[PDB]
Design a protein around this ligand. Sequence first.
Ligand SMILES: Oc1ccc(-c2nnn[nH]2)c2cccnc12
Ligand SMILES: [Cl-]
Ligand SMILES: [Mn+2]
Length: 335
Amino acid sequence: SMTSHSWLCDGRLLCLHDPSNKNNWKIFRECWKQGQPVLVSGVHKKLKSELWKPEAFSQEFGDQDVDLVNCRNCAIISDVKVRDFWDGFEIICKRLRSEDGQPMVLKLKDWPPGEDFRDMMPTRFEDLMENLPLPEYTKRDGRLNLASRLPSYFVRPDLGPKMYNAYGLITAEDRRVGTTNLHLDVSDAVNVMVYVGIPHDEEVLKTIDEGDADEVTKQRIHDGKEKPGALWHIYAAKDAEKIRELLRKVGEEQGQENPPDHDPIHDQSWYLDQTLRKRLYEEYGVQGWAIVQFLGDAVFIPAGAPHQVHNLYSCIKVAEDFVSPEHVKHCFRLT
Ligand SMILES: Oc1ccc(-c2nnn[nH]2)c2cccnc12
Ligand SMILES: [Cl-]
Ligand SMILES: [Mn+2]
């Protein structure tokens, strides 16, 4: 890369430019220790692109049974063949349709299942795990990954990467919907965008704009000609309780009958649309990071940080959990 790094979100987000640069840790840990997310671009240039095509997954694994989620209403489509998901990944009229006759925005639920990623896809496992940025943090045996070094007094993450596959959201009403709703995790994670399917183009730019993307990010589209995959909103762990207080208030306003100690973040049932994000800012002073994850971008999510994901197009992401020393406190089981 020409330069080692830059700053997105108007200076508030570190963006590293070379995913394999051995000096990345120096500037990374400076921002990581403050509870900030970090972005690393260019990972797709390190991978074998033919291994991350939706057509290839359908051909090699199409006969497996899976469950799908209708992102618009959270309904579950049970016990279908995974080729039913992949064959509609980019051709809309091949997609399963809802009772109202429209093609559904679908998320592939838990595939490969559990910890089976490595067993099912050995070559994809090697291709990714050998090219993850900041390897001392992210690799299973990295010197700064405590995942395999902590006693049972800490919540320890399951093994192997996960794959997250979902169609892109389309309409203006979809703008209030999430691919993955707001929640937090007790460990750190890195999430890599390995494929974006770009066949609506007007609503994508509008969604990015209303999502509060910065102008440098928008220039990655119009000048850099990069493919935007998903819109993230990430909030600092220290603001989690204020977010809960907002979502308890809104829930009551909407007639939900919840006990006063209800945890709407763990519930994973909310997506902060433009109205709620503006309200979170005006009434609680909480500001987040609005991140557009492009092809090859690796999003680093700090433990305890609430975060939500909104697919702009159909995406294939792969994520790996790890436990950094900076944030090990978030998986400790005692107060
Ligand atoms: O912590 C997370 C971050 C992003 C995602 C995700 N990435 N693309 N689509 N969904 C996700 C999915 C399930 C569980 N946790 C997740
Ligand atoms: Cl490292
Ligand atoms: Mn998660």
